[PDB]
Amino acid sequence: DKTVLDANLDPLKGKTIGVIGYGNQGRVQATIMRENGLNVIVGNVKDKYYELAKKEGFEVYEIDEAVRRSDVALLLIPDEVMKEVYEKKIAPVLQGKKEFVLDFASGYNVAFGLIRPPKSVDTIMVAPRMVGEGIMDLHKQGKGYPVLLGVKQDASGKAWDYAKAIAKGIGAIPGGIAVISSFEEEALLDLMSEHTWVPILFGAIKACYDIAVKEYGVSPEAALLEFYASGELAEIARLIAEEGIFNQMVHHSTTSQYGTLTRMFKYYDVVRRIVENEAKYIWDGSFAKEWSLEQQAGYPVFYRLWELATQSEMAKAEKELYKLLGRK
Amino acid sequence: DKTVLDANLDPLKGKTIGVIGYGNQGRVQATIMRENGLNVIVGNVKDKYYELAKKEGFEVYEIDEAVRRSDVALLLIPDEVMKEVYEKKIAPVLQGKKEFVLDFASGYNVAFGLIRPPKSVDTIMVAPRMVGEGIMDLHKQGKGYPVLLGVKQDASGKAWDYAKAIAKGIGAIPGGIAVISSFEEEALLDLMSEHTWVPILFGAIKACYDIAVKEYGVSPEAALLEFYASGELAEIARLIAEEGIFNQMVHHSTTSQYGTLTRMFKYYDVVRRIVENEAKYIWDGSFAKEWSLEQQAGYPVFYRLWELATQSEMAKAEKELYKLLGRK
Amino acid sequence: DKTVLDANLDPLKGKTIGVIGYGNQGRVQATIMRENGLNVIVGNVKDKYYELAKKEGFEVYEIDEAVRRSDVALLLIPDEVMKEVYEKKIAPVLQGKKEFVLDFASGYNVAFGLIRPPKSVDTIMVAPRMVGEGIMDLHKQGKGYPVLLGVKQDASGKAWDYAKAIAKGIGAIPGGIAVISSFEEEALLDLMSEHTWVPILFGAIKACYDIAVKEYGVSPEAALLEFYASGELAEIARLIAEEGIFNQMVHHSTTSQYGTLTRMFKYYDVVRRIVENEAKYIWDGSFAKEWSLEQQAGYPVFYRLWELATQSEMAKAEKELYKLLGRK
Amino acid sequence: DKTVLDANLDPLKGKTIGVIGYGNQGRVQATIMRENGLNVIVGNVKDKYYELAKKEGFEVYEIDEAVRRSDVALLLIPDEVMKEVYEKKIAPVLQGKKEFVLDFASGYNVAFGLIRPPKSVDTIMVAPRMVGEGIMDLHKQGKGYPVLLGVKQDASGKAWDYAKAIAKGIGAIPGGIAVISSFEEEALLDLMSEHTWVPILFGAIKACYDIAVKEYGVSPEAALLEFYASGELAEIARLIAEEGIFNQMVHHSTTSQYGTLTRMFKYYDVVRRIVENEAKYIWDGSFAKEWSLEQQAGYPVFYRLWELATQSEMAKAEKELYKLLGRK
Ligand SMILES: [Mg+2]
Ligand SMILES: [Mg+2]
Ligand SMILES: [Mg+2]
Ligand SMILES: [Mg+2]
Ligand SMILES: [Mg+2]
Ligand SMILES: [Mg+2]
C-alpha cells in the first residue's frame, strides 16, 4: 500500500541536527532522537525553555547560529510566529548554504506560500497525530505512533529517505506507521476538523440547553448533567478509538441505536453541504487571508466572541455547578 | 435552590425491599444499599444473573413472589421488555396490595402511558447519570453521584421522602447531588441527546471522510487518523468534563479557537431548528409510537441500516487499519 | 462473466429433499427434479394440494416431519404466510439439526430480517423469472430457463455448489442460464417493477381515457378500443421479448417512431426522479414496515382502493363493452 | 434608580492629574476642574495646542513625563491615533507604576480589545453627551450636563468613587446627571446612530430630490427649498429636545400629523430589520475590523465615496443656490 512500517537510518548518521524550539514537540523529538544516537543541538531564545533545555543536557546556541552549525533543522514552533523568525534569522543564513534539509510538523505556512524556501533546499514534513504527552506515554513502552509524510521540494533525490529516517529517529516507527501525503492534505485535514464537527457539536449542545430551558421548563442543573457535565462523552470516545465507531453502539440500548441511526441518515446531506463549503473555502486560500488580516487588525472579533461565549447563560450555570461538585 | 445534598433514611428502616433485575444497575444499587443496612431481596428469572446474585449472598425468589414479600420495589430492567413483565406478573399481585411504592430508573414507559399503575401506589423515579461501572469506581472512595427525582402519583404524602431516602440508600448522596424533576423531563433529555448531537456528529465525520477522499484525492488511512482514529476526541471530552467546555479551548492554538468560535456562531440557527423539530416530535408521543410499531413489524429498518453502516467504505477502511495498528 | 450455463450434480445425490408447498412452483420443481433422479418428498397441510400431490405419486408427510427426514428443503410458499410457518413448525426442528440447507425462491423475508435462521445452516436462493406455466411449456422441449442465485450464510464452503446443483435439478440449465446475485437485489428488482412502470402505465391509460371523454367529447366505446381493449399491447410486448425493445419499432410508421422517441427523451428525468424515490424507500426497509402494519390493521386501504378502482367510470364502460364483444 | 445626581470629591484631593490632549474636550475639562481646585497638568506634543495651553496658564510637559508625575490620567484624543500613543509612550511608563487610574471618554478601543491595560490599573470611562462648545455655554450658568459611567477593571474597590469624583470635577453634576453603564453600551450607542438613522435620513432626502426632478418635472431650486435648504428641520429638532418628540407635532397641521403617524407605523418593521442587522454587526466586532483594515489599505473607499457624493447633481445644485442666497 502507500504505507510504511520501518526504514533505514543511513542519512542522518554523521550529520548534525538542530531543533528549533523546546516546547512540547521539540522537547520530545529531541530527547528521543538523542536516545537513538544522534548528535543534537537546540536553538531557542533565552527564556524558561532555554534554561530547561540546557538543564536536560542539551548544548544550546542561538537560532541563527544553530542553523550555521547544522545540516538538518526542525522548525518546531507555532504557526503564528514562524514567518518573522524565518524571514529575519533563518533565510539569510540559508542563502549562505549549499545542501540543507528543512523539516516541518505543519504544512500551513508552506501550503499557502507564506514561506517560500529556495531551490537549493529539500523541504519536507513529518506530522504526528498525538497530543505529545501521550507520545512519551508510548515511547517508554517501545511503541510507535502514526505520522504523515510530505515533500514539497526535492533537490537531492533523497528527500523521502530523509523523511523516513526522521520518522524512525523520533520513534514513531517501528511500532506505529507512516503515511505519505502532501503539505496540502495535512493542512486541509487539520483545519476541516476545527471548522466542521467540533463547532457543530458545540452549537448543538448549546441549542439543546437553550431549548430545554426556555421551552419545556427544565432546570439548568439537569440539562448540564445530561448533555456534557457527565463523563458520558469520554467513554463513547474511548470505545470509538478502541472498538470502532459503529461497533461502539452495541454496548447501548436498542432504543438509542434506532434513534441514532435514523436521525444520522436523516441529516447527512445537510452537514455534507456545510463540509463542502468549508473545505472549498480552505482549498482556495481564503481562510489564511481572513486569519492573517485579523491578526493585523488586532483580534477584535476573537475578543468579542470569547466574551460572548463566557458571558452566556450556559457558562454561568456551569460555573455555579462545577463549584458545587467541587470540580475546580 | 431546587437541589438536595443529603436527607433522612427514616422510611426504609423496618421495610423489605425488592430489586427486580440483577444487571449492572440492579447489582450495584442492591449491593450498596445492603452495605447501608437494609433488608434486601432479588426477583429474577432463572438464568446467569440468578446464579450470580444468589452467589453474592442474596436470597433470590421469583418476581411475583418478590413483590408479595416486599413493601418497596425497584424495576431495574430494560425499557423494551418491562411492559409484558408488568402486565403479567406484577399488576395482579399489585391489585392485591394496600400501600406500595414503585420506583423506576427511566420515565419512558410511564411518561407515555405504556404503564399505568393504580392510585393505591406511590409512583416515583430515581435516575442516575453514570454508566454504572464508574459508580462503583466512586463508591469505594466514599463519593456520591448525581441523580434525578420525580413523582407521578402520591397516595401517601410521603413520596418525596421515600425518593430522598432511596437516593441516600444507593449512595448517591452525600457526595453527589439530587435534582427534582418529572418523568417527562428525564425521558425528553435521555432522548434529545440520542437524536440531536450524537447522530449529527457521526454524520459530519462521515461526510468529512467522503469529501476528502472523493474530491481532494486524500488517502483513507490519513482521513481516519485525523478525524477519529486518534484519541484526540477523548482528551477534549475529559477537559470538558473537568475544566469546562469553553475554558477547555485555552489549551489549543489561537487559529483553532478562532475557526471554532466563528463557525459555531455561524451555524447555530441551523441546528437549533433541528433540535426544535425533534424535541417537539418527542413531547407529543410520536417517537414512542414509531418505535413500538417497528418492534411489532420485526425490526426491518433497524436491520437494513445496521447493514448499510457496516458495509460503508469508511467502515471497511477502519477495519483494515485497526488490524494494522493491532487494535482488536 | 458472472454467468453460468451448466454445472455438476454431485452434492444432491444420496441426500433426501423436501418440498414445502405444492402450488404452481413446488409442483413444477418437484416433478422435474424427480424426473432427474432424486429422492423427493412433500410437506403440506391436508387440503386440495395434499390429495393432488399424493395422487401424482409423491409420499406426503406433515411439514415438521418432512424437515426431520430431509437434509435439504425448499420453502415454496407465499411470502405473506411463511413467517408463522417458519416460527412454529420449522425453527424448532431446525435447532435440532446438524448440517442443513434451506432454499428460497424469494428474498423478501430474509433480506429484511423477518426470518433469521441460525448459523449452522446454509441459506441460499434460486429465483426463476417465469410464470411457472410456461416453465413446463419449456421443459417438455428439453429447454432451460433463467434464474438468479444468492447466498446469505455459508457454513460449509459448499453453498454455491448446492445452488448450482439445484438450478440443474429443476431443469433451468443447461438450456437457460443462472446469474449470481444477492437476496437484496432480487427483492429490489421484484418490487421496483410493481412500484414504478406498471402503476405509471395504468395511471397514464386511465388519464388518457378521462381526458378524451371529458374534454374532447369522445365516446367511451372508442377510447377503450384505442387504449387497451385491442390486442395491440400484447403484440408490442412479444416483439420486445423477441426482436428487442428498440428494433421493435421498425415495424411501425415513421410518425409513430418520431413521436415516441421525442416524447421519451423529453420525459426521462421526471420518471427517473420517481424511480429514485421508490428504490430508496425500498432499500431502507420502509415498504416492508408499511405492508406488515397494513396486514396487522385489517387491510382497510387495500379494500377501499379495490372498491374505488372497480367503481370507476372506465371499469363500468369496459364491463358493458366486454359483454358486447362476447369476451367473458 | 441607576441614576446619580451629586457625589463626593474625596479621592482626587491631594493627587496630581494629567490631561492628555488639549483639543476641545481636554481644554474644557481641564479648565473646569482647575476652577474646582485641583492640581492639573497637560501632556501634549509641541504644536499649536501646546502654545495655547501653556498660554492659558497650564504647566505643559511631554506625554510620557506627564504620566510619570501623575496618579490619574485622562486620555482625551481621537480614537484613531490613541493606539500608537498608548503602545509607545504610555504602556512602558505604566508597567513601571504601582496604583494608577486611567480614564477614557470613548469605549471603542477598549470594548474591542485594541487597548488592554494591565491589572494593576483601574480602567474607567466618563463620556459626555454634548458637543463641547455648549458645555462651556452651560458651565458659565452653574448648570451641569449628562454623562455615562463605566468600569472595566477594578483593582482598588474604589473605581466608581473615582468616576463620580471625576464627573463632579468637570462640572457635569450637580446640575445634570450621571448614568452608569459599560464601555460596550457607549460604543454600541455612539455607532448605532452613525449607522442607522443619519444615513437613512440622508438617503431618503436624496431620493426625494432625484424622484421629484426626474419623474415629475420639478425644478431643483424648489426641491432643495422644501427638503433641507430651509431651516425647517432645525426647528423640529429644537421642539423635540424641548417639548418631546411626539408632543412636538401638536404645533403642526392635522394633515401632517395624520400622514406622519400612518406612514410611521407602516414602515416600522422595515427599519427595525436594518437596525437589528447593524447592531449585530457591531456587537460582534466586525465593523472595527473593517475600519482598521481600511486604514491599513489607504482609505480608497472613503476617497471614492467622498468624490461621488460631492460630484452628485444635488450637491452642484445646492452650490449654485447657496451662492445665490448669499450663504457662504
Ligand atoms: Mg486535528
Ligand atoms: Mg491544529
Ligand atoms: Mg443520555
Ligand atoms: Mg438511554
Ligand atoms: Mg416481477
Ligand atoms: Mg412478486
Ligand SMILES: [Mg+2]
Ligand atoms: Mg452620537
Ligand SMILES: [Mg+2]
Ligand atoms: Mg462619535
